[PDB]
Amino acid sequence: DNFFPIEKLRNYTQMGLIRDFAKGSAVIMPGEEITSMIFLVEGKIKLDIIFEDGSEKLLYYAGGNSLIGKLYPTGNNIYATAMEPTRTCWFSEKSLRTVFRTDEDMIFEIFKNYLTKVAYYARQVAEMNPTIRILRLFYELCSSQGKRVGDTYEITMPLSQKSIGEITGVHHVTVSRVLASLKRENILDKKKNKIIVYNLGELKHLSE
Amino acid sequence: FFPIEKLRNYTQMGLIRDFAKGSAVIMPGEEITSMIFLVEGKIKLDIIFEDGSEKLLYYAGGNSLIGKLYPTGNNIYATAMEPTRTCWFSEKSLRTVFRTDEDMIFEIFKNYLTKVAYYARQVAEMNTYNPTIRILRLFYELCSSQGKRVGDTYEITMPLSQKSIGEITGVHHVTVSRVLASLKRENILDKKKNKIIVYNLGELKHLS
Ligand SMILES: O=C(O)Cc1ccc(O)c(Cl)c1
Ligand SMILES: O=C(O)Cc1ccc(O)c(Cl)c1
């Protein structure tokens, strides 16, 4: 929710383009290339990221005085919709120059807003041992679905690393590291249609 | 993140500070009110949490910008990994830069936006704001690979406690209880003793 509302932007809306949106209309469309900052004069906007597989995850809720800082291409596919009657002011690069030439302080208000967002998201990435969750998942899977094949358990299941990451809330880069380490230590080998457990005892132990 | 090589043209407007390998660019608890341009060298920048736990935020090299012009309320610690030359730009000294070249405002916006785009995508990937989804995904994966079809239903044989579901998915046990109760009420899935019955795989697949 609310990011360093830029309330002083209220005074410069005459220098951008007003765009009003009815409840449920898409303020940003999937694959729409936005090259404007969007000021929320009043309303509520829900902004999501759409990953390259079509999953749609919430980033934030924007309300009165919020700034959507999407002045340039980002590599994230964004989809934003109005959740009430929303009035917005759109500020292209050209119109921001007009703002800065009137009031230089506005450059620093916008820095503060971006800075608030980096501080917020970076801290959350950091806040989130998540590794134990992958071990608990393999342990529960092995102990109920695992078939004894000589001195190994086999779980017949196409469980992609993407699915492991989604189930456990573990970043896709940590999943691959955990699995590499599991293989190297002769514990578990996560192949394509099967998972092979060589050491159920140590797996149980690591997981508890 | 977007490097700002052009800021090398304006270091005479800032304060040059050199750091030896291993020395602190930013000290624990230091109040930073300057952007820090890395002319040459290499910096590791960590967040320090209130328990004393330290976590990487990023590595920075040639032409990188540390955007900490205002207090954020994170405790940050940043060390030189090699001998490093830096240029410190206060708000005043940044105003002198922008009076000379208005485009440096927008170069800094791009740098900031690249950082929000990077951290926000990571937060979004991990379903931080909709962690219930990790539960649906667990059930969906289990059913699609281990489910046996019985009329218009699937049976999975799996002793799985709510405490286990929460430990696997990183989801609070109260949310776990609420999700299992709603699944059963909506006739989607029921976990009856050691058997998971899915009545509506299609709907469970849709939700996850
Ligand atoms: O567009 C992006 O990739 C991320 C994003 C979304 C909304 C914002 O207000 C910002 Cl600064 C960035
Ligand atoms: O200081 C912070 O809280 C986060 C931070 C760290 C480094 C940076 O370059 C930025 Cl823009 C923010």
Residue numbers in the entry:
A (entry chain A): 17 to 144, 148 to 227
B (entry chain B): 19 to 226
Q: Which passages does the manuscript contain on this structure?
A:
The transcriptional regulator CprK from Desulfitobacterium spp. induces expression of halorespiratory genes upon binding of o-chlorophenol ligands and is reversibly inactivated by oxygen through disulphide bond formation. Members of this family are homodimeric and contain an N-terminal sensor domain linked via a long α-helix (involved in formation of the dimer interface) to the C-terminal helix–turn–helix (HTH) DNA-binding domain. We here present crystal structures of the oxidized ligand-free (3.2 Å) and reduced ligand-free (2.0 Å), OCPA-bound (1.8 Å) and DNA-bound (1.8 Å) D. hafniense CprK in addition to an intermediate OCPA-bound structure obtained by soaking ligand-free crystals (2.0 Å).
Crystals of the ligand-free CprKC200S can be soaked with high concentrations of o-halogenated phenol acetic acid ligands without any apparent detrimental effects. The corresponding structures reveal that OCPA is bound in both sensor domains and establishes a near identical network of polar and hydrophobic interactions within the active site as described for the cocrystallized structures. A significant structural rearrangement of both sensor domains similar to that observed when comparing ligand-free and OCPA-bound CprKC200S structures has occurred, but in absence of significant DNA-binding domain reorientation. While the conformation of the central α-helices (Ser-108 to Ala-142) has become identical to the OCPA cocrystallized structures, the sensor domain β-barrels have only partly rotated along the Ser-108 hinge points. This is likely due to the fact that full rotation as is observed for the OCPA-bound structures would lead to minor clashes with crystal symmetry related neighbouring molecules for both monomers. We therefore speculate that reorganization of the N-terminus only occurs during or following DNA-binding domain reorientation. Furthermore, in view of the similar resolution and near identical crystal packing, a direct B-factor comparison is feasible between the ligand-free CprKC200S and corresponding OCPA-soaked structure. This reveals that ligand binding leads to significantly decreased B-factors for both β-barrels as well as the C-terminal section of the central α-helices (average decrease of ∼6 Å2).
